[PDB]
Amino acid sequence: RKVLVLGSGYISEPVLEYLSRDGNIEITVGSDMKNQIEQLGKKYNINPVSMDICKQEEKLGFLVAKQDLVISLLPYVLHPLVAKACITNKVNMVTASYITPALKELEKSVEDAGITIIGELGLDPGLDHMLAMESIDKAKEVGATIESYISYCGGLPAPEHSNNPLRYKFSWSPVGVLMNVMQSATYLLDGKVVNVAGGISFLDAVTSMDFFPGLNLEGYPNRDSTKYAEIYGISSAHTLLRGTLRYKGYMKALNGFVKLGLINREALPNPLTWKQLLCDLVGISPSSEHDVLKEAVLKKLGGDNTQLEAAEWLGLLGDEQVPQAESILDALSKHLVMKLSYGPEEKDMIVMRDSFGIRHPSGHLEHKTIDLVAYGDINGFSAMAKTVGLPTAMAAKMLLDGEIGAKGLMGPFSKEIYGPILERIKAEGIIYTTQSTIK
Amino acid sequence: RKVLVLGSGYISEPVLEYLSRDGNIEITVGSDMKNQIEQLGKKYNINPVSMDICKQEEKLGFLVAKQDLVISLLPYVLHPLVAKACITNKVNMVTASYITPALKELEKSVEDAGITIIGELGLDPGLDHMLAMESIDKAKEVGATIESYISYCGGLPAPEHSNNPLRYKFSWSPVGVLMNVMQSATYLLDGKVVNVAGGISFLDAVTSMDFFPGLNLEGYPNRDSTKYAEIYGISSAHTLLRGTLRYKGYMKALNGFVKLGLINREALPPLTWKQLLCDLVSSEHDVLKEAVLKKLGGDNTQLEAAEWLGLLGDEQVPQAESILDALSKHLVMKLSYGPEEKDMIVMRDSFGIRHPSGHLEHKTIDLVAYGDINGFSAMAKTVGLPTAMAAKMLLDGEIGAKGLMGPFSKEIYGPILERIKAEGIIYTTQSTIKP
Ligand code: PRO
């Protein structure tokens, strides 16, 4: 009956709420942000401890030894420091993030220490693995084989709050997100490695997603889908597709910013204004009421009015001061948060769509679809916080109660982990359904 | 500290939950259905009373006299029977439905009795009046006039539960909603009374509603919009329009059933849907050309809708009074709300307010609500809670007004609109000036 929560940010709040229901656990919290931990201590009964991870490793060793379990809700670079204390002190661990190559090297040491370290929990990586392996294990139980695996997931605002040029709202500064439009995408299609070029030509790969008629979505492949053959164990499959869901016109609006030359890490040029900045990008002197409009509309896709109106709406042509930043990308990101932030009583939404093609030994081809949908609570937590938070907290509770016997470094791929979690998420307001057809 | 809730439907559950929070009121329930009141009596602490409003009018007179307030959640035709008991015994009342012409005749007797009766509460009629009068009173407070009033509302499934030919799920047997396509529509637009016929030509009146880009809606006008000029006091307006909201493809699917001749009350002919469809257009196998020929000029979307529901299959047809009622029992079987499937309410008002300055104010109001997995539906909350809140205001002694009335005064709509945010019913406002 003792747990340490390293981190005091977005994901930490729903984790503390879930554990505090039963009322038989001494919850300690460790973080850098002094303003966050004091406000969090008012709501939930916890033991606040100011502690740096890298600089103050000494007190971490003494503190972690007292506890039973360690819930790491920190950035994924710092997990080897947290895991190093666990293997020496002989205590369990849980993570809501990627198992990195650095953490993979400790796997030999973790099994020798005789402790459990679960990783890759939450939304993605997390619930995407659990839904996939549930369906893949069910197929292999009846002698079937996986021929195709198409999957899509997206964290969005609720439809009612989608009335803006991007049809989106940012929780934090999208510095890492916007630069990923320039990256390529790779996936498998009918036994052929398809490669999609990024940047300006990436709008060609954005297709309509009409699986929910009422919801007006679009979709596109991301990063790398061939990776999931070895992980899930479906090398026989002829198709492997992983993608992201957005509302229609999102990618076309971002494509406008790529055309103007805003998506780059070059430095900036009386305070600077947005009217003056776009004049430098297009290549004119800063003096233009409606002359910069004619210059911008010419550059934007050869007279794209929708992209011009989007820049007009955000105030990129008008007279507004540019925030202090290291680059043009950081200036755009800071402005997008200021203009398109979440309100006090505005919901968010998670949608996840899987589609399996399962060949049975009888000869028939089963088409199995899986939907997972969750809305954010008005007087509660957001859908993103719940889907990322609750699987980590549930997995932690299983270790304390003694419902997981396996040892070593591991994901949520085994039925011992994912089975209980998928059953319990129904009560937390995260509903998922199944539909099957044969042909 | 005592109240009677007449009726034991799905609307009563959120009303009983709201009143039982503080724990300072002895709630009583009266209904015909013995199964409902027993199951409802298990959840909330209530006194069950087995009685019929029409058959046993004597015990109603004695029971109502004991209570401080009455809450009628019965069909709207039976309000004069409840109202007659209230005026005799001198007891207050609230209603979650229309104030009919029959109930309007009692207004003289209600004023002499010296009691409060508040009608037209819930989603529609109810919250439509509250959102409207909040905006109209604010306009008249600054000497402005209403030129345009365009409004839309709709109860429908959540986006994730919309993958079906109609993009809809029914709670009970749809008898009236199918026949409502045959009825005509009337509204005011630019200083003239417009009329739109039902039947085959009604599909032309349907238009795309793209106020939320992420949501894929359509809309069409209600039976009558001209009545709202006298109600809200906006005869000066040149455009009045109240309409219904659905997902795209709903009316186009229903238009297909009108082409085949399914929507008609003329009695039924073991019978099957394959046999019935051939008679309208027995016969040989396949013959898909007969269905698609009558159903528009090669409309594949409307044809596949019939195949999906199974109107060409060999399923049994239920015992019904007509062909329309037979289709209602089939649609409620196939397209139905499951145990873990959420619904949604969406409401959209649009005003054109002319100030004495000369500028035109374009004001918009959104009201949205979702169902709860471990709770009540969006339809149950928006219909139930306004009547429950109005019941609490009478007991606490906030509503000082007397006689028969709606929720048109700021005394009524003001407190209710403020409190609904806490119950999970969010509504927002936006305004822009246009010279
Ligand atoms: O891109 C998004 O919206 C989410 C983030 C994790 C997976 N999909």
Ligand code: PRO
């Ligand atoms: O037909 C509909 O969907 C709306 C719901 C409330 C009033 N009419």
